[PDB]
Amino acid sequence: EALLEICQRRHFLSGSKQQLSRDSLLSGCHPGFGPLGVELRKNLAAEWWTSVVVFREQVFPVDALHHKPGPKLRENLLHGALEHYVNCLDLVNKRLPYGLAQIGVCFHPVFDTKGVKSIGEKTEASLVWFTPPRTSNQWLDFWLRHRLQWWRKFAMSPSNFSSSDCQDEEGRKGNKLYYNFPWGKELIETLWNLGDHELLHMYPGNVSKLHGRDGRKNVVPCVLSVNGDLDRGMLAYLYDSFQLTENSFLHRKVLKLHPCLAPIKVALDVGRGPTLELRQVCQGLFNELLENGISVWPGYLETMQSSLEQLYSYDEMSILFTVLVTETTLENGLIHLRSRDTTMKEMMHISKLKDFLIKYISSAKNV
Amino acid sequence: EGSEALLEICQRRHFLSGSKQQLSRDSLLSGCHPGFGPLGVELRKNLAAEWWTSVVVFREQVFPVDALHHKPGPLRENLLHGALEHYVNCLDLVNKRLPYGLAQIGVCFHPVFGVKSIGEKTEASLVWFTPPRTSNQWLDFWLRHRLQWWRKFAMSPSNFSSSDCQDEEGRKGNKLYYNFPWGKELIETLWNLGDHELLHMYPGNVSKLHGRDGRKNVVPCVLSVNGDLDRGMLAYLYDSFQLTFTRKKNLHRKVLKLHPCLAPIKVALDVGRGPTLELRQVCQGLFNELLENGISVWPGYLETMQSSLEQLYSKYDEMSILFTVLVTETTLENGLIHLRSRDTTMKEMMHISKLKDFLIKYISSAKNV
Amino acid sequence: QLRHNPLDIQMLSRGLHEQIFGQGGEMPGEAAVRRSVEHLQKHGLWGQPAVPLPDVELRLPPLYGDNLDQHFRLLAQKQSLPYLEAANLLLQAQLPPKPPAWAWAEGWTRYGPEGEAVPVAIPEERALVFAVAVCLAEGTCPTLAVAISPSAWYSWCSQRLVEERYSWTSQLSPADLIPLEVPTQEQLVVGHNVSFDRAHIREQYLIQGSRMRFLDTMSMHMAISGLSSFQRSLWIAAKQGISSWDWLDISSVNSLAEVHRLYVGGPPLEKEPRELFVKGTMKDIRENFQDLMQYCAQDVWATHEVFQQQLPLFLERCPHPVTLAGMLEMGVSYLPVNQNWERYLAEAQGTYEELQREMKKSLMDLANDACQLLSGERYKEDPWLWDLEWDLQEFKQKDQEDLGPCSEEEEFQQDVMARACLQKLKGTTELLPKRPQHLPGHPGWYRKLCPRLDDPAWTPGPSLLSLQMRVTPKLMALTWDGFPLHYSERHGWGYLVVCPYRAIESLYRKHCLEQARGGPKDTQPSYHHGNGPYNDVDIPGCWFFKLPHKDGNSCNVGSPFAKDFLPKMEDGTLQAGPGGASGPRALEINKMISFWRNAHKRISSQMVVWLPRSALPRAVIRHPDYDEEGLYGAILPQVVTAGTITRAAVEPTWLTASNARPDRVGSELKAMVQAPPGYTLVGADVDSQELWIAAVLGDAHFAGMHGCTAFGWMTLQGRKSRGTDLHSKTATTVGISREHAKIFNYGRIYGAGQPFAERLLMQFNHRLTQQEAAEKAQQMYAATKGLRWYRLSDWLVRELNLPVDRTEGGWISLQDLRKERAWKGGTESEMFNKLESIATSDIPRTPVLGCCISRALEPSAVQEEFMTSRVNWVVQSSAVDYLHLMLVAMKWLFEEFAIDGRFCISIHDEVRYLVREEDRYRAALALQITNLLTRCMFAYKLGLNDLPQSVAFFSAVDIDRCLRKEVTMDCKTPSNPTGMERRYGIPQGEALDIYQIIELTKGSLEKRSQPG
DNA sequence: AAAACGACGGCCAGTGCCATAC
DNA sequence: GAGGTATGGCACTGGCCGTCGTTTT
DNA sequence: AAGGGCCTATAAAA
DNA sequence: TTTTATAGGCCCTT
Ligand SMILES: Nc1ccn([C@H]2C[C@H](O)[C@@H](COP(=O)(O)OP(=O)(O)OP(=O)(O)O)O2)c(=O)n1
């Protein structure tokens, strides 16, 4: 689609036109992400971390190795969390319901007839939740609910994010999450009730080490594995931001990425006038916004060699607001502010700009 | 020695995972350690965040980049090659304004002497493309800045040292070391690599690689800054434990004086004796408020009362927690809570409404000191 | 062309001696030669080998008048004639009444006789009385100014005052400054501290020379009725509420109000009560525009009346034209800078901050540990921390099983319940005291060390800590020779609520293991030795001793971390409690950052004005070194032309700017003054200026020969390879090191006495017991400046007819009846006698230019009161006359031979000019010629025509691109580690001898004659 | 509910000591 | 009869005025 | 080693 | 948005 071309042009995705394809993107063998894509994925991972780890008192970070020493590569983050389970049980004084969360790259085989074999990478976010079996399935539903809401939290079309129920061979419940890409539904997150077979197999003998406290009685924990693909989630959000044509009333195109997820919040540029004065004012505003944690695209370093319409068509970069500083700003301090969502142009004083952006981001977060 | 007690504290306080034998100096330095505990992971996350804020966020010409872990694509040793590949594509970001950087933090794999194993080190790299006329100047700039960054969070900044070194091909470079109790260990390397690798990467038309040095077009010289964040975390852990004496040894308090920006847990919250329901309600409210403002809190109030206040203080000091917050029956009446600082071990009264603002101000100001 | 003095001293070349009108001079006598040779033999300084100097022959430029004195008089009169004419126009000027209301119009406005305000581009006037006002809050851009000219008033307003604008340029340009200079005829601007006003007129920042000069009422006030800093304290204390105070009613401090009181008198002038420019904002200035303009006009009027009174007095009191010409030349001084300056500032500040933070962290950590001593009450057992306040206060007053997950509504309700429950605590917060407490649960000293929370610049922990605080030596547990330190109120730092003397004794025993009134109760002796009072402070264990001080037992040590205690730290007498290198590192950091801590508020705030490409000359533009992306600008140092009683220049920043030092953070300050492309700095410092002035005065007083006295001989022909040099001879005669002899001589020559020498001897060798050392000092003095002989100067012969004692001179006899002081045989006695004669004359005047001393230092006002001040003033004002002579001669040579140059800076000894690269060598030759002419003028005014070849020419002129003591210095500093060359494209200059210069320039200053 | 008083703290001038230059 | 002439900063101390808590008819 | 050919990209503009 | 002007850069001229 044209969205892939825009991502190629606006440095969301790296590589050539042939290197970027539906099959290549889904397989994970694409050359890599552009800086904007890296920032979007970083924001998505931060949002995942804030909604899972700091959300619950019982969830801890964990570091798992990538190579699994012994003469292979990593496929999932479950093994590392299971390895750290016994050590981290002492962290909670064996209070059984607790989680280990980790975000990292896992590798899977990929190959095509056109042969040999290649290796694909997927950045996954994993939560391993050790819970008493009596409530284990209940907790599964809980996490399912939460995960679904999280996917719907930043989505323009949450109906594209769907949940399905599935059962194991031996009757273990689980849930799958899908996003409806234009060609069909694709799996983006998996929740499984794994019982305690992997954990027991990891410690043959000394099962007393794995006991966790649950109402003054000791039981071997049930393991819930939640695994989400942040790469495919970022791709899904990019496709969700490309809601057909642009706003207002040439059929140009805008990516209405969520304010919390948009890699760049505001773009700063100069008008016509004294270059030194305008660049000084823009540098000051840029430093102010960075010191206040607002990502800024420094367009004033290129002056305004391009036209205003092409400059706005930032919209392909999913920038929330565009700020233009002119010689008028040197007199009264008023700058031109264009919104991405509404395409409305406004006059605003610089003093209020940082506060307005912070309040806008905060309200977008709380909605 | 005090190194054994520091390792015992790290193992006990879940800074480092694995057994005592698995945490040998060779195992830790080689990168073949089993892995980090949650506190170690959080400390490394804070260190990487500070690196990103001091390299990426406050520079217009430095951009994030993701490099794959596997070289062939038919393993990774350093992050330089991916940035070198992305150089031409990312040149469009600055309209070929030559001095610009690509920064990345990621795990690299290094073979070591089964008979031979593989160690992992999460390293942070900045690849700085600069006009050749200013290459050495930029090298000095980055050397100074990186050394200052390492000394910024250090209790004994003199342990972080810089050395000048020469390439076998005659290329200048700088190395950074931390003085562990056993000697100096390399933690960061800055090299002026020229453009030979870049030219070899793009055979044929060299005009594709040209960047604007003001009004001139020149093939950039590549500056590679690569720091070991695992070894940096280990260095800061060793730096928090004062190995020094006299009255200091008379006090002999086991505390990890980690920098506020690097400390994995900022605040510890616990209840006293009294009506449990109201105290649990107020503590849950305060905990949610503090988390909502991005301040890490250790929920000690969820555990029952089995240790004394002194035991809690020693446990939190070994965890390098900046402040301890106590909610008593007094808080239900007048709202005052007890705040104990890690640095001075002194207790103070503070009202709950002011606590979040004070903590945020403390964390923000710690950088500005 | 080789001449020798009758004392066998290499003289000026016979070719050049006749060109300085040496032919037809006086012939030295024979009895004087006999006496001088006998004196040299008595001092053992006669018959020494002489190394011949290669004589210099070159066609000197034309010399006007009969003698050199008339030459300098003619040159200075020509240079200062137009400005004297303009000053007379101001003097004999009847001014109209100032307008009833001020313009409030951008730019300059001229007020007609009826008060009408007609806008003008610039005041079309040749002489003006000037006063510039700036809004300090807004930076350094001038806001408004007022000017008085003969029959005209002018007022200038800034666009930043008249126009309300959100943003103005942070980096000033000449367009922001105010215009005064008339384009192509020469102007004079008069003001009180006129340098500040000059720093705000645009045309003065151009690289090309400006015909406009400036006269400062402060400088003339110091010339006529000035006082020393000690005299300033005395005057201020007397007017607020030494035996003779007759000088009070004739001198005042340099403030414009009291200058108006002294010279004009009448109604007092009232200052601005709110100080809106200094403290208020631009809005306050706008709201009080008329009042502030009226105050500025009042300042202009007061300065005008003061100048009217001063100019006749100054011209009468400094009758030589060279003084006025040199003051005019010093008025305009130019410091070229580029963008690198800014970087320097940032770098310096950054370095400073880092070096500070480290230090503070160390100190802060100590404090964070000391609080633990309150837990065990062990602070009273601490040999250092028992003196502190450890008070504290209080605040003010009047297991289950797994329940599983929760419903979405359930967790929603739980979260909202928690938030609502937490809001109640904030509601309670608003009921407790309005004034918060500052660290109630912390000790008193730690509460003092921490910034208050409401402080806008707040940092966590005891960030107020510094090495200079009294608590800091206690926190580091500083130990002096096994002794804990202590602070006595009357006597500073020494080495020893109940004092833990048992702990102190245990600590001393541990230190010994590591390796005097005798009351055992309370105050105790030491069986150890040292200085200071002992038993004034009462301690239960009180082997108390003051720390040694470089300024004697009377003085006290204010901080153990002073730069002179680093050698004691390295010795090991002074040690740190934690041990290792914490103490040495702290003292190293203090040494590195002391200069910047003192001078950053000045160096950073220094005013730069950046010239645009249009203002840049074509020579600079068409040059390879011209970087179009770079910035080129200037700093005009705000020099008070005569800021001391000695009429020496005073500038807060650049006359005290430290030279490059490897440890001082900002020491590359003078190196940061870099010439623009196409220009270089040609400078030179006078070789032992004060020493040679003193020596030549002594030689002229003793005989008609050069080097006739022993001190003059030593100064002229000292050599470090063998003896016969001054410092080595002093060391040989006294018995101590040559460096100690040098410091002794340089301390003495400034009018010193017995206590200085005794203190230095005791500090150097404590092994020499007090009185013995004193005797040593006395002998030193008997060798340098012979013993005083009173010679009936208390009548005295009538009292002598008792008869008692013999001889026609006194023996410092004391009569104790209660009913011309000279010196004796010594190397420096003749010059001391000459200086005392000049000081004690009825109207002390400088021997060369005839400039008088202040009316507050005249003997008729200060009889036998300020003697050291006057004897030092003689030499220092002679040095100022030397500087004026050099400036006049250099200006004459430049304007005569079309050398494209400008006066850059003068720091007492040093003079540096900004010349073109083409004419740098001609400028160096001109500098050599000027030095020769000034030395010969000094010699002639004293009475001797010939001049020694040793001091005839400059040792070496420095052609460089920046201000450095030596052209070879790379200026490695903590803030400039990469070095000058590697940081900025500034290469090393070159030092040229007189022979090198003449070989390069063919001995001519003409562009046509210069080789190519 | 209005009036006297004591305690705590901030602002500015004075003093002592140290750091630069020539 | 005094090491001199300048510059300036920082730490410490004391005097004065505003505010707040406490105490009287 | 210079200055004088060739295309040739740049940036505010008549 | 050129077009002619401005410094870059590279091939050919004593
Ligand atoms: N670029 C410079 C730097 C310095 N000087 C001179 C001026 C000083 O007077 C002299 C230093 O003189 P000392 O006091 O150090 O004496 P000397 O070392 O020259 O004398 P002696 O040979 O007796 O040791 O350096 C100079 O002419 N040009």
Residue numbers in the entry:
A (entry chain C): 67 to 137, 180 to 222, 227 to 361, 367 to 430, 432 to 485
B (entry chain B): 64 to 137, 181 to 219, 227 to 357, 361 to 485
C (entry chain A): 68 to 251, 262 to 318, 342 to 498, 526 to 623, 645 to 663, 721 to 999, 1003 to 1027, 1046 to 1238
From the paper:
Accurate replication of mitochondrial DNA (mtDNA) relies on the high-fidelity DNA polymerase gamma (Pol γ) to faithfully copy the parental DNA to the daughter strands. Human Pol γ coordinates the activity of DNA synthesis in its polymerase (Pol) site with self-error correction in the exonuclease (Exo) site to maintain high replication precision (1–3). The catalytic subunit Pol γA consists of Exo, spacer, and Pol domains. The Pol domain adopts a canonical right-hand configuration, with subdomains termed Thumb that binds to the upstream (−10 to −5 region) of primer/template DNA, Palm that houses the catalytic site, and Fingers that constitutes the incoming nucleotide binding site.
Pol γ mutations, R853Q and R853W, result in devastating neurological disorders. Arg853 is not a catalytic residue, yet its substitution for Gln is completely void of polymerase activity. To analyze the structural basis of reduced Pol activity and nucleotide binding stemming from Arg853 substitution, the ternary complex of the Pol γ mutant holoenzyme was formed with PolγA R853A exo−; Pol γB ΔI4, a 24-nt/28-nt DNA; and a correct incoming nucleotide, dCTP (2′-deoxycytidine 5′-triphosphate). The complex was crystallized, and diffraction data were collected to 3.4-Å resolution. Although crystals of the Pol γ R853A ternary complex were formed in the presence of the correct incoming nucleotide, dCTP, the binding mode of dCTP differs from that of the WT ternary complex. In the WT Pol γ ternary complex, dCTP is bound in the N-site by displacing Tyr955 and forming base-pairing interaction with the templating base dGn; Arg853 forms an H bond between its Nη+ and the ribose O4′ of the dCTP. The N-site is still occupied by Tyr955, and the templating residue Tn is precluded from the N-site, adopting a configuration nearly identical to the binary complex in the absence of an incoming nucleotide. Different from the WT ternary complex, the correct dCTP binding did not induce the closing of the Fingers; instead, the Fingers subdomain remains in an open conformation that closely resembles the WT binary complex; the RMSD of the mutant to the binary complex is 1.435 Å and the ternary complex is 2.248 Å. However, the Fingers subdomain of R853A is slightly less open than the binary complex, with the Fingers subdomain rotated 1.56° toward the active site. The measured dissociation constants (Kd) were 55 nM for WT and 37 μM for R853A, which correspond to ΔG = −10.329 for WT and −6.298 kcal/mol for R853A, indicating that the lack of Arg853 resulted in ~4 kcal/mol binding energy reduction and a 670-fold lower binding affinity.
